[PDB]
Design an enzyme around this catalytic site. Structure first.
Site, PDB file in Angstrom:
ATOM      1  N   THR A   1      15.966  -7.118  15.559  1.00  7.91           N
ATOM      2  CA  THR A   1      16.499  -7.007  14.199  1.00  7.91           C
ATOM      3  C   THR A   1      15.794  -5.877  13.415  1.00  7.91           C
ATOM      4  O   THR A   1      14.564  -5.787  13.418  1.00  7.91           O
ATOM      5  CB  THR A   1      16.355  -8.378  13.454  1.00  7.91           C
TER       6      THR A   1
ATOM      7  N   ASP B   1      19.682   8.331  26.916  1.00  5.96           N
ATOM      8  CA  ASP B   1      20.655   7.543  26.139  1.00  5.96           C
ATOM      9  C   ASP B   1      21.159   8.270  24.872  1.00  5.96           C
ATOM     10  O   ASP B   1      21.268   7.682  23.785  1.00  5.96           O
ATOM     11  CB  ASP B   1      20.037   6.184  25.774  1.00  5.96           C
TER      12      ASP B   1
ATOM     13  N   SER C   1      21.173  -6.560  13.224  1.00  7.23           N
ATOM     14  CA  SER C   1      20.807  -7.833  13.843  1.00  7.23           C
ATOM     15  C   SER C   1      21.624  -8.081  15.114  1.00  7.23           C
ATOM     16  O   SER C   1      21.273  -7.612  16.201  1.00  7.23           O
ATOM     17  CB  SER C   1      21.026  -8.979  12.847  1.00  7.23           C
TER      18      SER C   1
ATOM     19  N   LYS D   1      11.455  -2.373  12.844  1.00  2.00           N
ATOM     20  CA  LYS D   1      12.224  -2.974  13.922  1.00  2.00           C
ATOM     21  C   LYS D   1      11.364  -3.880  14.796  1.00  2.00           C
ATOM     22  O   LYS D   1      10.447  -3.409  15.473  1.00  2.00           O
ATOM     23  CB  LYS D   1      12.854  -1.885  14.786  1.00  2.00           C
TER      24      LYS D   1
END
Length: 304
Positions: free
Chosen positions: A28, A138, A26, A48
């Site tokens: 969330t 990432d 969260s 999600k």
């Protein structure tokens, strides 16, 4: 046609097929069960979502576009989306959580066989992402999820970019970017290639070997660009032979074409995974439990 049609299926799932069971994070993230209608199956999932901003649903949907296009044992699968009040992503549940928190939590039971294998597996996913011409942008230990201790998958494609069959870079813009995991060209010219993924791979391997250390712990991000220019990199981790640490360091050449290709990382770490103890020195290594042919590699690890 210049590019190949992306014929991934986006599956849309009824609100009532889930049984959301608990918060994991969260936006969330939740744990739940997915029961496909009719089918005698119950599938453990993470769900999600995010209130609803017209700008927020645009970005989670790009994430779904990407997750829905990848299909590999070491990359996370989108199972579908649910188009209710706010949009929910549905994936296979990775019960043991992200890998960063996991090495921290289990430090004293993690042996060299697991570390080097995780390394092989992450390189396989990343090499697959490269085949599908996709630049994760990432990669970090936090974005690797653990299905079992034996089995990790790359996740979090909320920044992945597709390169054309002839575009050899990506030029990004504004937005938060984790700079400590970032190649140098990516901090100066916001350049991102498969080879700048390799840098971040470098830093990710370093997170695992140091059992979950924050890179340049202390050093604030605004200076990172400069430290890296003065020729300085991350230290050799305690458990690391120069053989392993040498590969890390190669991932950090300033010339990005001199860095290793993900398919070379797969081969290098395979060989090392065949004599784990000759490459990582972990105290109490041999007796650990979690839930000449130097050059031999299996064909399954030889991908050209």
């Amino acid at each position: 046609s210049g590019e190949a049609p992306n014929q991934a299926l986006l599956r849309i799932l009824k609100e009532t097929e889930f049984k959301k069971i608990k918060v994991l994070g969260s936006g969330t993230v939740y744990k739940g069960l997915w029961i496909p209608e009719g089918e005698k199956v119950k599938i453990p999932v993470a769900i999600k979502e995010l209130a609803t901003s017209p700008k927020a649903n645009k970005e989670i949907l790009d994430e779904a576009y990407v997750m829905a296009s990848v299909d590999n044992p070491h990359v996370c699968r989108l199972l579908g989306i649910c188009l209710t009040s706010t949009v929910q992503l549905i994936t296979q549940l990775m019960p043991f959580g992200c890998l960063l928190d996991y090495v921290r939590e289990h430090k004293d039971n993690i042996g060299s066989q697991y570390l080097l294998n995780w390394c092989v597996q992450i390189a396989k996913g990343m090499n697959y992402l490269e085949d599908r011409r996709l630049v994760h942008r990432d990669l970090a230990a936090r974005n690797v999820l653990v299905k079992t201790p034996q089995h990790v998958k790359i996740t979090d494609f909320g920044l992945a970019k597709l390169l054309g069959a002839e575009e050899k870079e990506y030029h990004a813009e504004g937005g938060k970017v984790p700079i400590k995991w970032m190649a140098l060209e990516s901090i100066l010219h916001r350049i991102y290639t498969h080879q700048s993924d390799v840098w971040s791979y470098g830093v990710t391997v370093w997170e695992l070997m140091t059992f979950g250390s924050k890179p340049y712990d202390g050093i604030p991000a605004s200076e990172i660009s400069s430290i890296l220019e003065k020729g300085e990199r991350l230290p050799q981790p305690p458990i690391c032979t120069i053989d392993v640490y040498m590969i890390m360091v190669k991932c950090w050449m300033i010339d990005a074409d001199s860095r290793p290709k993900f398919r070379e990382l797969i081969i290098e770490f395979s060989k090392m995974a065949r004599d784990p103890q000759r490459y990582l020195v972990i105290q109490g290594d041999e007796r650990m439990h979690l839930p000449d042919m130097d050059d031999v590699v299996d064909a399954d690890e030889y991908l050209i």
